[PDB]
């Protein structure tokens, strides 16, 4: 049969800490075989996600392999028993590649720290998307990030009116969704941000107080900032940061509090591996801490409820989901790099349209 020319970003070099996109990634030209097994598909990439958790995926990617990532793909061609037909849109972990072949079946992440299984590709139905909630939201508020926020806030956390909710890593999409939902449930909402503009932006989304984690560098400076922003204690904590801000929150946990652990940026990215033992602080509060791994909620029923509940709020404008769509496959690493800059222009989910 035949082949096609494709471009891929591949992992050139492993560097821990804050990644250097120009140094770690290299754009190569690749020839793709277009011969399809009975259930395989030939896919074109329309949109690609960039996310912080790619820092850890990258370090587990064999050198030379392509950078994995969440993406939106269109089926160009398909074998006879492929799950989707040409023209069908799917969301899945297609990676930083213009084109690819895959059967869309669940695949195990072999070289990762845990036995993680990337989900089967998911069919996208155009009826769910419009100008208010466009197709690219399948990578954001109607995707992984939305599912993480919405699943946590309806399957685990039980915000009550009058509660104080703290959200670390609040300026990103998952943080802002959690805060806005908490607000709807009647809570005082405290966030952390890196800039006066980002802090003002969270105040526009309805955060009642925002702490600057660059001035508050230590649990001490942090404890004081929290005690001011949350004088009555903390009832819920949505944690994407860990490290010293989380150490400070655990000193002021109220009774029956709940902590959702979504990420530990300060450990994973900043390599903060040791610190004060936190478990001694949860007994009298009777606090509940749940690890979040939102892949467990990727079910057809959860996707429908996501669209009904969360999609309605976004559409009625009762809940704001911003995205920064950068254009051009060649600018994927540059767009990924801004997740770690000091630029305040990073509103919501960062995306690349290809």
Ligand X SMILES: NC(=O)c1ccc[n+]([C@@H]2O[C@H](COP(=O)([O-])OP(=O)(O)OC[C@H]3O[C@@H](n4cnc5c(N)ncnc54)[C@H](OP(=O)(O)O)[C@@H]3O)[C@@H](O)[C@H]2O)c1
Ligand Y SMILES: CC[C@@H]1C[C@@H]2C[C@H]3/C=C\C=C\C(=O)NCCC[C@@H]4NC(=O)/C(=C(O)/C=C/C=C/[C@H](O)[C@H]3[C@@H]2[C@H]1C)C4=O
Distance separating alpha carbons of residues 193 and 250, to the nearest angstrom:
19
What is the contact surface with ligand X in residues (CB under 6 A)?
51-53, 144-145, 148, 168-169, 171-175, 192-195, 198, 213, 240-241, 262-263, 265-266, 283, 292-294, 339, 343-344, 346
- Report whether 191 contacts 169 (CB < 8 A): no
- Report whether 3 contacts 36 (CB < 8 A): no
x/- mask, a copy of itself, residues 124-143, rule CB under 8 A, reads --------------------
- Report whether 197 contacts 344 (CB < 8 A): yes
- Report whether 238 contacts 232 (CB < 8 A): no
CB of 59 to ligand Y, least distance (A): 8
Residue 172 known to bind ligand: yes
User: Which residues make beta-bridge pairs with 43?
Assistant: 75, 100
CB of 115 to a copy of itself, least distance (A): 8
Residue 304 known to bind ligand: no
Of residues 127-186, those binding ligand Y (CB under 6 A):
144
DSSP 56: H
The two tokens of residue 347 are: 């509103």
The two tokens of residue 234 are: 């903390």
Of residues 142-201, those binding a copy of itself (CB under 8 A):
none
Distance separating alpha carbons of residues 256 and 252, to the nearest angstrom:
12
Site size with a copy of itself, rule: CB under 8 A: 35
Residue 301 known to bind ligand: no
- Cβ proximity to ligand X: between 101 and 211 the closer is 211
For the CA atoms of the chain, what is the radius of gyration? 21
**Binding test (CB under 8 A) with a copy of itself, winner from 32, 185, 282, 320:** 282
C-alpha 81, offset from chain centre: 32
CB of 158 to ligand X, least distance (A): 19
x/- mask, ligand Y, residues 273-292, rule CB under 6 A, reads ----------xx--------
Let me know the angle formed at the C-alpha of 352 by 347 and 354, rounded to the nearest 5 degrees. 155
Distances (CA, A) of 354 to 20, 93, 182, 322: 22, 15, 35, 19
Decide which of ligand X, ligand Y, a copy of itself, none touches 19; Cβ closer than 5 to 8 Å per partner kind. Answer: none
Residue 292 known to bind ligand: yes
Interface with a copy of itself (CB under 8 A): 113-114, 116, 239, 242-243, 246, 261-264, 267-268, 272-280, 282-293, 296
Interface positions with ligand Y (CB under 6 A): 53, 56-57, 70, 92-93, 112-114, 116, 118-119, 144, 268, 283-284, 293-295
């Amino acid at each position: 049969l035949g082949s096609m020319k494709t471009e891929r970003w591949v992992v050139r070099e492993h560097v821990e800490g804050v990644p250097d996109a120009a140094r770690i990634y290299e754009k190569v030209e690749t020839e793709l075989n277009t011969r399809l097994g009975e259930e395989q598909m030939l896919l074109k990439t329309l949109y690609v996600s960039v996310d912080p958790y790619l820092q850890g995926i990258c370090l587990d990617t064999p050198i030379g392999d392509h950078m994995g990532a969440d993406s939106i793909m269109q089926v160009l061609d398909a074998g006879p028993n492929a799950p989707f037909r040409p023209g069908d849109l799917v969301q899945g972990f297609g990676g930083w590649r213009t084109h690819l072949v895959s059967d869309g079946k669940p695949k195990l992440w072999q070289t990762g720290t845990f036995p993680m299984v990337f989900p089967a590709y998911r069919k996208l139905d155009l009826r769910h998307y419009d100008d208010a909630l466009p197709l690219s939201t399948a990578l954001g508020v109607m995707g992984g990030p939305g599912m993480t926020a919405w699943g946590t806030m309806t399957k685990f956390m039980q915000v009550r009116p009058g509660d104080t909710v703290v959200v670390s890593g609040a300026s990103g999409m998952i943080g802002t969704l959690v805060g806005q939902m908490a607000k709807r449930a009647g809570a005082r909402v405290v966030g952390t941000a890196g800039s006066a503009g980002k802090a003002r932006y969270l105040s526009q989304l309805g955060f009642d107080a925002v702490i600057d984690y660059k001035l508050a560098d230590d649990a001490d400076k942090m404890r004081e900032a929290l005690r001011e922003a949350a004088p009555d204690g903390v009832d819920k904590y949505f944690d994407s940061i860990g490290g010293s801000v989380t150490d400070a929150v655990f000193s002021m946990l109220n009774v029956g509090s709940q902590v959702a652990v979504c990420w530990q940026w300060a450990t994973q990215v900043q390599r903060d591996y040791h610190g004060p033992r936190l478990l001694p602080y949860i007994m009298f509060p009777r606090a509940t801490i749940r690890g979040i791994f939102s892949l467990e909620w990727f079910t057809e029923q959860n996707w429908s409820a996501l669209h009904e509940e969360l999609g309605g709020l976004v559409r009625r404008q009762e809940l704001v989901a911003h995205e920064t769509v950068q254009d051009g496959f060649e600018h994927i690493p540059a767009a990924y790099q801004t997740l770690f800059s000091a630029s305040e222009s990073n509103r919501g989910k960062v995306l690349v349209r290809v």
